[PDB]
Amino acid sequence: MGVEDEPLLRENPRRFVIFPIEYHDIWQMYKKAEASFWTAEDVDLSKDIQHWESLKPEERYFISHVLAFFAASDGIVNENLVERFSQEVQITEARCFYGFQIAMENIHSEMYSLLIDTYIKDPKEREFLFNAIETMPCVKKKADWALRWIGDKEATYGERVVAFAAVEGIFFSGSFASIFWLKKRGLMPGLTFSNELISRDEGLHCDFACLMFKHLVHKPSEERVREIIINAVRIEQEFLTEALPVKLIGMNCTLMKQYIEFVADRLMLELGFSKVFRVENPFDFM
Amino acid sequence: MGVEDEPLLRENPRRFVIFPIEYHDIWQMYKKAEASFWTAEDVDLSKDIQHWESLKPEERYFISHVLAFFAASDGIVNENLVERFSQEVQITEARCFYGFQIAMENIHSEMYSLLIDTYIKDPKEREFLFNAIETMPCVKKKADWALRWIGDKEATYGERVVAFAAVEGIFFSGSFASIFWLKKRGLMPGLTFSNELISRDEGLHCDFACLMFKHLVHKPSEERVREIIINAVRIEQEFLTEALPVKLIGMNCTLMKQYIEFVADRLMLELGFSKVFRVENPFDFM
Ligand SMILES: [Fe+3]
Ligand SMILES: [Mg+2]
Ligand SMILES: [Mg+2]
């Protein structure tokens, strides 16, 4: 107390000793992550260019901006893992998971950057996209929100792990759904396949957060979690209807907003709480 | 003055933005690490037990203690990366390398613990081996040496990178040579195959340390590096002739002492300095 009460956070003089395994549930999530290892080199982009060039200009605009958003957001997720989560959490099984997640986020960032470099040849446009945190007001709201949680010296691990589940689970959900929308339309095989890998990885990353949450003795209140989650949904709904509207690829904004809320409900439930919005999933492809 | 003149250590606002690549040499080491990913599940141990049982008791003793040394040492290397190297280096290319190295060290530790668990069924013996830092004086000397460098709040990154190149390159060299000796004897294909993968990884991790050292503006003196490396050599020579003699598995202790010195000379050359001992490689199998 405050921390010596928490098995996840209290002193572990065996932290760097791997065996024997004591947290089998945490360990199997690490093994699952490890078994699904992939690299950017595994994704075949050799046919994407033609698909890309036949798209409408606003579809290229929407896609390049989603890609720049993802590449930037990964670095912030990664920053949080490197400076905070992988440091403060003391159980070996979670250290292994977070170590592997960092490696996977670097793979995700590389993948998104290779996609950008494959589709966009103009060095000026590349740089504008790589520096999205500074150049794109739309991503600003999300980037700064996630970044505040890293700098917050007061928020408990229980709060901050919820916040990053919202980052990986809510802030990403609209963009993931957008790319799945394009798969329904049979466009860019490289993009849509990499998208399946990455959204799978992200879902596992969120599931892990919920597992860590469950193992906490002192959890934040349902009310506190509600307001982090609701807040995140609002930022996400705004990003997708105002900052970078999904109409640009032919999607119904209203249904998108509904999906974001369905996602947050599923996360609230996976966190041991009650639904906030009580809406259905409008997308049968998700 | 002090660190804002070190490209590797100074402020990098782009540290979590992956592209574009600027340090192509550092980045290619990461790509090489990434392309050689493997898991413990890749290694078949089923043909080892029969050989294990054929050995003399002193040989099983030697091998299990080598395994316990390696398992314990990995977690110290890992501790250093998590708490120091991966935090203090600011260039993206190297952060990617070190992030991947952490993951691989966890795979190394797992491999070593699986080897122990596969060969040794006795629960009391397993626990004695897993707690080698506390239970085995042979490994305390090496563990304490490495651990002192993590706790050293004064020594430069330049000194510390050399020190951990000595850990992964000198403190491991005699043990790696031991296992290659067993291969030459046709024994335990599971163990010796895992040893091929791990010594290769460790060689790469040492190469990376030299690459980083070369990118440093304020290097420590050849004198100071000689002091660190000669010290590591004597500890390692003590380890393999006195604390856990290599005679136990049929090896000549004098030729082994000479091998350590040859490994150190190669490291000194790789760091941009001069040989220390000027002795040849006694082992045709290394
Ligand atoms: Fe290593
Ligand atoms: Mg442990
Ligand atoms: Mg960078």
Side-chain angles (χ1 to χ4, degrees):
Chain A
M1 287 173 183
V3 146
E4 215 207 76
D5 189 21
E6 291 282 7
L8 265 39
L9 308 179
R10 75 199 171 178
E11 201 174 19
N12 178 9
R14 296 273 298 241
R15 51 180 156 169
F16 296 109
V17 178
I18 202 158
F19 275 19
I21 304 299
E22 310 290 19
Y23 290 86
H24 295 94
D25 52 346
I26 303 169
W27 182 252
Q28 288 306 310
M29 284 206 72
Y30 162 64
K31 300 296 298 176
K32 191 179 182 201
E34 186 193 9
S36 61
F37 181 79
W38 59 280
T39 66
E41 289 74 14
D42 291 335
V43 178
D44 181 2
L45 299 183
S46 73
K47 306 280 187 291
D48 276 23
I49 317 74
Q50 191 205 77
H51 276 92
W52 171 257
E53 295 185 331
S54 97
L55 289 175
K56 307 177 180 189
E58 43 275 305
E59 289 175 331
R60 281 193 294 277
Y61 173 88
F62 181 89
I63 293 166
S64 63
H65 280 44
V66 159
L67 291 178
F69 155 71
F70 273 144
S73 295
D74 279 353
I76 307 177
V77 169
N78 196 295
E79 175 173 356
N80 187 61
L81 297 170
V82 164
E83 292 174 358
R84 302 209 69 193
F85 289 0
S86 70
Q87 308 296 318
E88 65 194 316
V89 162
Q90 301 293 308
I91 60 146
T92 296
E93 296 87 343
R95 291 193 154 233
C96 286
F97 185 93
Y98 283 142
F100 200 87
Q101 182 173 349
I102 288 159
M104 285 320 295
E105 298 299 337
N106 291 331
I107 287 166
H108 293 183
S109 288
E110 186 186 14
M111 183 70 249
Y112 286 124
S113 299
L114 273 163
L115 284 164
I116 286 167
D117 280 359
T118 302
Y119 304 161
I120 311 292
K121 296 308 167 170
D122 179 356
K124 294 162 204 166
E125 186 63 17
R126 289 183 176 183
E127 196 35 54
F128 172 82
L129 296 171
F130 298 142
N131 208 14
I133 285 167
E134 287 183 356
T135 63
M136 287 170 54
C138 53
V139 321
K140 176 169 192 56
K141 249 206 163 87
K142 279 175 174 177
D144 285 337
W145 193 86
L147 280 158
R148 280 196 292 276
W149 288 112
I150 305 179
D152 190 324
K153 291 156 190 179
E154 291 315 318
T156 59
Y157 173 73
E159 288 178 290
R160 290 172 296 106
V161 76
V162 162
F164 278 89
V167 170
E168 295 186 272
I170 292 166
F171 280 12
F172 282 4
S173 64
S175 301
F176 285 143
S178 297
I179 299 166
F180 279 110
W181 176 257
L182 305 169
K183 178 189 162 90
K184 193 149 212 170
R185 300 174 49 192
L187 326 169
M188 264 105 73
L191 180 63
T192 63
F193 178 67
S194 69
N195 187 66
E196 293 166 352
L197 301 181
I198 296 168
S199 63
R200 181 209 52 196
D201 293 351
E202 294 308 292
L204 191 69
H205 302 162
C206 291
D207 293 341
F208 187 82
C210 296
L211 196 55
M212 291 301 96
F213 192 76
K214 183 172 178 48
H215 280 269
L216 291 165
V217 176
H218 301 326
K219 293 168 172 52
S221 68
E222 177 152 18
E223 185 55 50
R224 181 49 177 158
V225 169
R226 274 181 72 94
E227 86 181 48
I228 296 171
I229 290 324
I230 288 161
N231 184 22
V233 163
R234 293 319 177 204
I235 297 171
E236 176 66 2
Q237 286 174 324
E238 195 251 58
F239 175 85
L240 299 155
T241 59
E242 175 171 318
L244 187 66
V246 291
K247 302 192 286 185
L248 303 170
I249 53 159
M251 298 189 80
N252 184 326
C253 278
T254 294
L255 296 179
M256 183 51 88
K257 274 188 172 189
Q258 194 190 313
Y259 178 74
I260 302 311
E261 284 167 9
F262 163 80
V263 170
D265 277 350
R266 184 173 51 196
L267 178 64
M268 287 299 295
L269 280 179
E270 208 190 343
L271 282 171
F273 303 110
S274 293
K275 298 194 182 209
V276 167
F277 303 100
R278 277 179 190 81
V279 296
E280 302 251 289
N281 177 14
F283 301 139
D284 63 357
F285 56 91
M286 304 301 293
Chain B
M1 300 68 188
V3 127
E4 292 299 302
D5 74 323
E6 290 287 6
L8 264 41
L9 310 171
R10 70 193 178 186
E11 180 104 300
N12 180 13
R14 298 282 296 246
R15 60 177 162 174
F16 290 105
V17 177
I18 209 148
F19 274 23
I21 301 310
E22 291 289 277
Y23 290 84
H24 289 94
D25 56 346
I26 296 170
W27 181 253
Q28 283 306 315
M29 286 214 57
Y30 164 62
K31 301 301 292 178
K32 183 170 190 215
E34 195 195 356
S36 65
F37 182 76
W38 60 278
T39 73
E41 286 74 14
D42 290 337
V43 178
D44 174 25
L45 303 180
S46 59
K47 313 272 175 275
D48 283 15
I49 297 91
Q50 180 169 36
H51 296 161
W52 177 248
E53 293 173 355
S54 81
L55 301 175
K56 311 172 195 182
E58 318 79 77
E59 290 173 309
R60 282 189 293 280
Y61 175 88
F62 180 88
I63 293 160
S64 67
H65 281 47
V66 162
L67 294 172
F69 160 67
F70 271 149
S73 301
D74 279 352
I76 299 170
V77 164
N78 184 292
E79 178 180 358
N80 184 58
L81 297 167
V82 161
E83 290 175 4
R84 305 214 65 191
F85 290 179
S86 71
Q87 308 296 310
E88 70 191 312
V89 175
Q90 299 293 313
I91 61 157
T92 299
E93 293 89 339
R95 284 171 149 264
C96 287
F97 188 93
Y98 280 142
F100 200 84
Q101 183 178 352
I102 289 159
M104 289 313 298
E105 299 297 344
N106 288 331
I107 285 162
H108 294 185
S109 302
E110 189 190 12
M111 186 69 250
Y112 285 123
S113 303
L114 267 168
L115 290 157
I116 288 163
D117 278 352
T118 302
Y119 306 149
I120 311 259
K121 294 312 171 161
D122 188 325
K124 289 157 209 148
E125 191 61 26
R126 287 169 172 191
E127 193 36 54
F128 177 79
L129 294 171
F130 292 142
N131 212 14
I133 299 166
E134 287 176 32
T135 66
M136 288 169 49
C138 55
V139 329
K140 196 177 161 60
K141 216 180 188 84
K142 285 208 262 187
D144 283 343
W145 195 89
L147 281 165
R148 275 193 290 275
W149 293 107
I150 309 186
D152 199 317
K153 287 182 177 188
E154 286 97 53
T156 58
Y157 174 74
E159 285 170 304
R160 293 179 291 103
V161 219
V162 167
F164 276 94
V167 170
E168 307 186 78
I170 296 167
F171 284 182
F172 289 174
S173 62
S175 295
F176 285 142
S178 297
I179 312 317
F180 276 111
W181 180 244
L182 296 169
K183 188 195 175 189
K184 194 165 189 199
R185 285 171 60 182
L187 306 162
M188 295 161 82
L191 168 66
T192 65
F193 180 64
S194 76
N195 185 70
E196 289 164 34
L197 298 171
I198 297 169
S199 58
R200 181 210 50 201
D201 290 351
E202 291 311 296
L204 191 69
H205 300 157
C206 294
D207 295 339
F208 183 83
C210 298
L211 184 55
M212 296 295 284
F213 186 83
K214 174 198 154 187
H215 282 270
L216 288 171
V217 173
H218 303 302
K219 301 181 166 71
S221 46
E222 175 153 19
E223 149 95 310
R224 179 53 184 154
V225 176
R226 274 175 79 100
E227 181 165 35
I228 295 168
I229 291 313
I230 290 163
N231 190 17
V233 167
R234 299 314 186 202
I235 298 177
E236 174 67 358
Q237 280 169 336
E238 195 269 348
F239 180 80
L240 308 146
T241 62
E242 179 171 314
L244 195 63
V246 293
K247 172 199 270 265
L248 295 168
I249 50 144
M251 297 189 81
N252 179 265
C253 293
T254 308
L255 294 183
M256 179 55 74
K257 268 178 156 172
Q258 190 185 309
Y259 175 72
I260 309 314
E261 287 173 1
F262 166 86
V263 162
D265 277 1
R266 186 168 55 190
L267 181 62
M268 291 298 292
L269 293 175
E270 201 179 353
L271 283 167
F273 301 123
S274 287
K275 302 199 192 223
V276 168
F277 306 98
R278 321 193 100 89
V279 299
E280 293 274 311
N281 179 8
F283 299 138
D284 53 314
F285 55 92
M286 304 304 298

